[PDB]
Amino acid sequence: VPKTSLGSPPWPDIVLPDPVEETRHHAEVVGQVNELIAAGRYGRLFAVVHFAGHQWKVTAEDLILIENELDVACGERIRLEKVLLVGADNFTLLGKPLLGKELVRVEATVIEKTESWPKINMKFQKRKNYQRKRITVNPQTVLRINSIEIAPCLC
Amino acid sequence: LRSRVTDRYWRVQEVLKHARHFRGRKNRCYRLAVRAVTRAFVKCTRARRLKKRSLRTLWINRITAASQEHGLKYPAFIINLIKCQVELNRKVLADLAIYEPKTFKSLAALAKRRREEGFAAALGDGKEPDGIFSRVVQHR
Amino acid sequence: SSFSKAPQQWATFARVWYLLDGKMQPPGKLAAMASVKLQGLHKPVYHQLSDCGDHVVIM
Ligand SMILES: [Mg+2]
Ligand SMILES: [Mg+2]
């Protein structure tokens, strides 16, 4: 097997660590990040949330506009549950494909209940004499996001 | 009993409301106005449909560029992110690509890792080893 | 990460000169990447209506 431009597969060789060393290394790394959470060294967190059929990027003091009516009194404090991502300058927690409740918590307040600005929808047809004009008004809900807290427990 | 239409003024006003910013004679003459306004609304509603594919195109491009920076192509990145059971929007993904470059390079490292794990698994020709990122979690 | 507003703005949209050596390259494969970098399609901040795109020097 001499070297010809073909006989050698065109890509870098794959170096894959042993599962044992990886289990140790993981236990250790998770341990360390865990020490950062316990310490309180995370400056500001941002989260990726799944709400009302969309995904969002959320941080404390921020604002989002949800496209349908929720049944909540105005000013109540909601706790969002399905959480995809959590991240901070030094570290990031990734859910498969969801983050466990005990690990992280994100609490928002509903600010505004509104009807959306009129959306003009009109179908038309060439010389069939067909027009249909309809104006749409959509109930909307604005959320202030208050807090993202992250608990020490990670194993 | 002869009747005439007294309020014709507001009838015209209602279609000229929408016609003010057009160029030329469409913003005055009621005919030209009526037609150009119907055109305008039709394209309004078609645009509603388009702008979802436009935004998604934009996102895919930004994900492609962000992925290229770390030396990984778009299909590789997306597939492997999925095979790791991480479900993220292309919207959320492109936003991570811009406003959190660190996290995003973390993701690209993850995907690349998972992929090499794949090549090694499939070329290895044995059923036993589960790459640490190849395990599949069933929810409880 | 903490910059004033005007300098953050400036840093993000900076035009960056690229050099690309040509000798013995198929002119098509050259123009492929030359075009990508020209158009701004390597920048995650890219948009069609932004002026962003970078110089390209082919030698
Ligand atoms: Mg009379
Ligand atoms: Mg639809």
Automatic annotation (TrEMBL), chain A:
- According to the UniProt entry, the coiled-coil residues are none
GO CC annotations, alphabetized? cytoplasm; ribonucleoprotein complex; ribosome
**Keyword check for Ribonucleoprotein:** yes
UniProt keywords, alphabetically:
Ribonucleoprotein, Ribosomal protein
What GO MF annotations does this protein's record show?
Answer: RNA binding; structural constituent of ribosome
Provide the GO biological process annotations.
Answer: translation
Instruction: Describe the family membership recorded for this protein in Swiss-Prot or TrEMBL.
Output: Belongs to the bacterial ribosomal protein bL21 family.
The protein here is known as: Large ribosomal subunit protein bL21m
Native organism is Sus scrofa (Pig)
Q: Which residues of the full protein are shown?
A: 55 to 209 of 209
